[PDB]
Design an enzyme around this catalytic site. Structure first.
Site, PDB file in Angstrom:
ATOM      1  N   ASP A  57       0.790  -1.218   0.000  1.00  0.00           N
ATOM      2  CA  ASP A  57       0.000   0.000   0.000  1.00  0.00           C
ATOM      3  C   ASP A  57       0.828   1.277   0.000  1.00  0.00           C
ATOM      4  OD1 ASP A  57      -1.757   2.008   0.224  1.00  0.00           O
ATOM      5  OD2 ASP A  57      -2.821   1.214   1.975  1.00  0.00           O
ATOM      6  N   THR A  58       1.093   1.796  -1.195  1.00  0.00           N
ATOM      7  CA  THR A  58       1.952   2.971  -1.316  1.00  0.00           C
ATOM      8  C   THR A  58       1.332   4.247  -0.753  1.00  0.00           C
ATOM      9  OG1 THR A  58       1.191   3.438  -3.569  1.00  0.00           O
ATOM     10  CG2 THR A  58       3.157   2.064  -3.319  1.00  0.00           C
ATOM     11  N   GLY A  59       0.028   4.223  -0.505  1.00  0.00           N
ATOM     12  CA  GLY A  59      -0.635   5.355   0.132  1.00  0.00           C
ATOM     13  C   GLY A  59      -0.621   5.293   1.653  1.00  0.00           C
TER      14      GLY A  59
HETATM   15  C1  LIG Z   1     -13.921   0.868  -2.931  1.00  0.00           C
HETATM   16  N1  LIG Z   1     -13.123   1.901  -3.609  1.00  0.00           N
HETATM   17  C2  LIG Z   1     -12.326   2.640  -2.844  1.00  0.00           C
HETATM   18  N2  LIG Z   1     -11.426   3.487  -3.335  1.00  0.00           N
HETATM   19  C3  LIG Z   1     -10.671   3.907  -2.312  1.00  0.00           C
HETATM   20  C4  LIG Z   1      -9.717   4.834  -2.247  1.00  0.00           C
HETATM   21  C5  LIG Z   1      -9.041   5.076  -1.054  1.00  0.00           C
HETATM   22  C6  LIG Z   1      -9.428   4.357   0.070  1.00  0.00           C
HETATM   23  S1  LIG Z   1      -8.576   4.540   1.599  1.00  0.00           S
HETATM   24  O1  LIG Z   1      -9.525   4.276   2.753  1.00  0.00           O
HETATM   25  O2  LIG Z   1      -8.007   5.952   1.674  1.00  0.00           O
HETATM   26  N3  LIG Z   1      -7.341   3.475   1.700  1.00  0.00           N
HETATM   27  C7  LIG Z   1      -7.725   2.057   1.589  1.00  0.00           C
HETATM   28  C8  LIG Z   1      -6.762   1.169   2.391  1.00  0.00           C
HETATM   29  C9  LIG Z   1      -6.568   1.738   3.803  1.00  0.00           C
HETATM   30  C10 LIG Z   1      -7.341  -0.247   2.493  1.00  0.00           C
HETATM   31  C11 LIG Z   1      -6.236   3.848   0.813  1.00  0.00           C
HETATM   32  C12 LIG Z   1      -4.966   4.015   1.647  1.00  0.00           C
HETATM   33  O3  LIG Z   1      -3.799   4.079   0.825  1.00  0.00           O
HETATM   34  C13 LIG Z   1      -5.044   5.250   2.549  1.00  0.00           C
HETATM   35  C14 LIG Z   1      -4.887   6.546   1.733  1.00  0.00           C
HETATM   36  C15 LIG Z   1      -4.966   7.655   2.578  1.00  0.00           C
HETATM   37  C16 LIG Z   1      -3.876   8.503   2.706  1.00  0.00           C
HETATM   38  C17 LIG Z   1      -3.940   9.563   3.610  1.00  0.00           C
HETATM   39  C18 LIG Z   1      -5.085   9.798   4.369  1.00  0.00           C
HETATM   40  C19 LIG Z   1      -6.215   9.015   4.158  1.00  0.00           C
HETATM   41  C20 LIG Z   1      -6.145   7.938   3.273  1.00  0.00           C
HETATM   42  N4  LIG Z   1      -3.909   5.171   3.476  1.00  0.00           N
HETATM   43  C21 LIG Z   1      -4.014   5.169   4.810  1.00  0.00           C
HETATM   44  O4  LIG Z   1      -5.112   5.115   5.381  1.00  0.00           O
HETATM   45  O5  LIG Z   1      -2.853   5.269   5.507  1.00  0.00           O
HETATM   46  C22 LIG Z   1      -2.949   5.292   6.923  1.00  0.00           C
HETATM   47  C23 LIG Z   1      -1.882   4.365   7.452  1.00  0.00           C
HETATM   48  O6  LIG Z   1      -0.631   5.048   7.163  1.00  0.00           O
HETATM   49  C24 LIG Z   1      -0.888   6.484   7.194  1.00  0.00           C
HETATM   50  O7  LIG Z   1      -0.558   7.111   5.902  1.00  0.00           O
HETATM   51  C25 LIG Z   1      -1.687   7.888   5.458  1.00  0.00           C
HETATM   52  C26 LIG Z   1      -2.798   7.765   6.498  1.00  0.00           C
HETATM   53 CL1  LIG Z   1      -2.787   9.255   7.486  1.00  0.00          CL
HETATM   54  C27 LIG Z   1      -2.391   6.619   7.409  1.00  0.00           C
HETATM   55  C28 LIG Z   1     -10.440   3.418  -0.048  1.00  0.00           C
HETATM   56  C29 LIG Z   1     -11.055   3.242  -1.213  1.00  0.00           C
HETATM   57  O8  LIG Z   1     -12.042   2.396  -1.567  1.00  0.00           O
END
Ligand SMILES: CNc1nc2ccc(S(=O)(=O)N(CC(C)C)C[C@@H](O)[C@H](Cc3ccccc3)NC(=O)O[C@H]3CO[C@H]4OC[C@H](Cl)[C@H]43)cc2o1
Ligand SMILES: [Cl-]
Ligand SMILES: [Cl-]
Ligand SMILES: [Cl-]
EC number: 3.4.23.16
Lengths: 99, 99
Positions: free
Chosen positions: A25-27
């Protein structure tokens, strides 16, 4: 390996004597796993994503193996709906995005 | 390009003639942007993250440039903490993970 993104990039990790499935998960800044036991010290943390924050336990210097690649890093444990491997460990296995 | 993960993989996108910053996010199925205006009709979608779900507006067949690479596809708009480019568009620009 070269991992396609047609499907969710799921891998098996070995951690704390357990095998688990997790998303590359690059995000994600940090690696976040569902409730599990880990040894050693920890401190509480809030991490934020889509939908707000959850409270997690932060464990540092935890050995992990991903796809034959050993690494060590911080693992956050708490009520995440899905296990994610974040950048803190992706760097260590030499994972890059390419296009 | 090859993008390492020691910092967040933030890139410039262009949508509706405007530049924005967004995070290349292999853990996101879908692309979600902060509040903005897009053309046409939208459909409802709930998307789920670390902290629970949010409601977003779904717009289809939207042109968007990601690091200068041209894509046309679904963009979700709502109260996300950060603009994220998910696998729906990462596949359009030929992105893979490699290690
Ligand atoms: C069904 N289609 C859909 N498209 C999505 C897009 C994003 C997301 S998401 O909830 O943001 N997420 C899904 C993952 C956690 C399973 C993508 C994930 O990379 C999210 C992207 C993100 C980045 C910053 C703030 C909020 C969100 N990453 C994430 O929650 O990271 C957590 C754990 O590490 C930290 O780095 C960023 C945030 Cl603050 C923390 C869900 C989605 O669902
Ligand atoms: Cl770390
Ligand atoms: Cl490197
Ligand atoms: Cl799409």
């Amino acid at each position: 390996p070269q991992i396609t993104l047609w499907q969710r990039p799921l891998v098996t990790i070995k951690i704390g004597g357990q095998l688990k499935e997790a998303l590359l998960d690059t995000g994600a800044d940090d690696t976040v796993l569902e409730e599990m036991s880990l040894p050693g010290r920890w401190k509480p943390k809030m991490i934020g994503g889509i939908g707000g924050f959850i409270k997690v336990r932060q464990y540092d210097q935890i050995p992990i193996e991903i796809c034959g690649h050993k690494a060590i890093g911080t693992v956050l444990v708490g009520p995440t709906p899905t296990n994610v491997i974040g950048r803190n460990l992706l760097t260590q296995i030499g994972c890059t995005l390419n296009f």
